[PDB]
Amino acid sequence: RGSHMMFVHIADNHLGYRQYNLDDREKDIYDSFKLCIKKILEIKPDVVLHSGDLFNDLRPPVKALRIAMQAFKKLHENNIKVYIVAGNHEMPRRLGEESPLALLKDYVKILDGKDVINVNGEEIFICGTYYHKKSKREEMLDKLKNFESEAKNYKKKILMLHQGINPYIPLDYELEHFDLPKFSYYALGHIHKRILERFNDGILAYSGSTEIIYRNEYEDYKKEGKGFYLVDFSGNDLDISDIEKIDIECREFVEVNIKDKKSFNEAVNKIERCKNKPVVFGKIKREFKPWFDTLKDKILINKAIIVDDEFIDMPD
């Protein structure tokens, strides 16, 4: 709970992303979003920190754009200052082309340098910048030293970035853990998975994506949770213990592995238990495919793999 000062660190929503070309997948993304926004409007943090990739394209579907203005307009009418850094998907490619973030200019401040927020009441230091490509790594080194210099005489200092770091995204990454200065809090984004762990005299954060945009984020979803992280900075120091990570419910995926009767019955009991039609993935032996075709109507989509091979490898 709390507090005296508080704020949210969310990232990666990918509004307008129509997975498996499913009209219905498009929708779920806006829902997890519209959801997150609802939590945050309750919690009323004094400021919000969006580590980028709010959108999923330089020219989003109109609805994604509207939902995102309506959202942040609400946030801003409710006296909550928002900072957002530009992710890869929000960076213009041709000279003069404009991000789709440049539609949230009135509700949101885009970080590309340094600023200090008086809050109520106190003083803290934000710096962050947009998404630079692996190549522009050098460009950035300077960017951070500069940042560091103006950040030293400042007790509480926050860093916003949308990039692949090296201890965290083995390939491909654009920065090294040893590339970046020492800050109270590292509000990053671009890693679609919740990653809160202390770091160089402060705490690093990877809000994570707000809905299973892969193709991986399965177990990560269920064990940890997708959504944002709620920080507060009411108190001097900060440990993993003053960061209340909020979870956000979404479309249920079920992993199947269908190879005997045991596991074909398993995969169904899991799909009964499902509150909503699920996206189902994993493997299904070819021989059971058409038996499982039997649940077409209880299932949003079947993105499991059909296995034509026969396996002997038992368990020990």
Q: Pick from 190, 226, 245, 285 the residue near Mn ion by CB under 5 A.
A: 190
Q: Does 46 bind Mn ion (CB under 5 A)?
A: no
Q: Pick from 53, 90, 174, 252 the residue near Mn ion by CB under 5 A.
A: 53
Helices 62-77 and 23-43 cross at an angle (nearest 10°) of: 0
Tell whether 4 is in a known binding site: no
Tell whether 53 is in a known binding site: yes
Tell whether 190 is in a known binding site: yes
Tell whether 46 is in a known binding site: no
Q: By C-beta, is 170 or 315 nearer to Mn ion?
A: 170
Question: In the bound complex, what is the minimum distance in angstroms from residue 90's beta carbon to Mn ion?
Answer: 9
Q: Does 90 bind Mn ion (CB under 5 A)?
A: no
Query: Restricting to residues 3-22, which ones interact with Mn ion according to CB under 5 A?
Result: 12
As given in the structure block, the two tokens for residue 24 are 């219905």
Q: Does 174 bind Mn ion (CB under 5 A)?
A: no
Q: Pick from 3, 88, 166, 234 the residue near Mn ion by CB under 5 A.
A: 88
Tell whether 192 is in a known binding site: yes
Q: By C-beta, is 130 or 288 nearer to Mn ion?
A: 130
What residues are labeled active site? 89
Q: By C-beta, is 53 or 211 nearer to Mn ion?
A: 53
Tell whether 78 is in a known binding site: no
Select the residue whose beta carbon is closest to Mn ion and give its number. Answer: 53
Q: By C-beta, is 88 or 263 nearer to Mn ion?
A: 88
Question: In the bound complex, what is the minimum distance in angstroms from residue 238's beta carbon to Mn ion?
Answer: 25
- Please give the residue ranges that form the binding site for Mn ion (CB under 5 A): 12, 53, 87-88, 190
Binding residues: 12, 14, 53, 88, 162, 190, 192
Binding residues for Mn(2+): 12, 14, 53, 88, 162, 190, 192
